[PDB]
Specification:
- The protein is mostly loops.
- The protein has a single domain, classed as Zinc finger, CCHC-type (HIV-1 Nucleocapsid Protein, Irregular).
- It has no helices and no strands.
- Bound molecules: zinc ion (2 copies).
- One zinc ion binds next to loops.
- It is found in: Virion.
- This is Nucleocapsid protein p7.
Amino acid sequence: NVKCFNCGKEGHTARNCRAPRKKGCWKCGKEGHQMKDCTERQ
Ligand SMILES: [Zn+2]
Ligand SMILES: [Zn+2]
């Protein structure tokens, strides 16, 4: 279902989530790096 980019629990988005944004990958789902770090773009 819909899930969050911040914390990644379903039934809400990062725009709803007031859990501040996380250290893991905001996108690719791994956590051995952050959203900046991730070579998903590159
Ligand atoms: Zn969330
Ligand atoms: Zn990543």
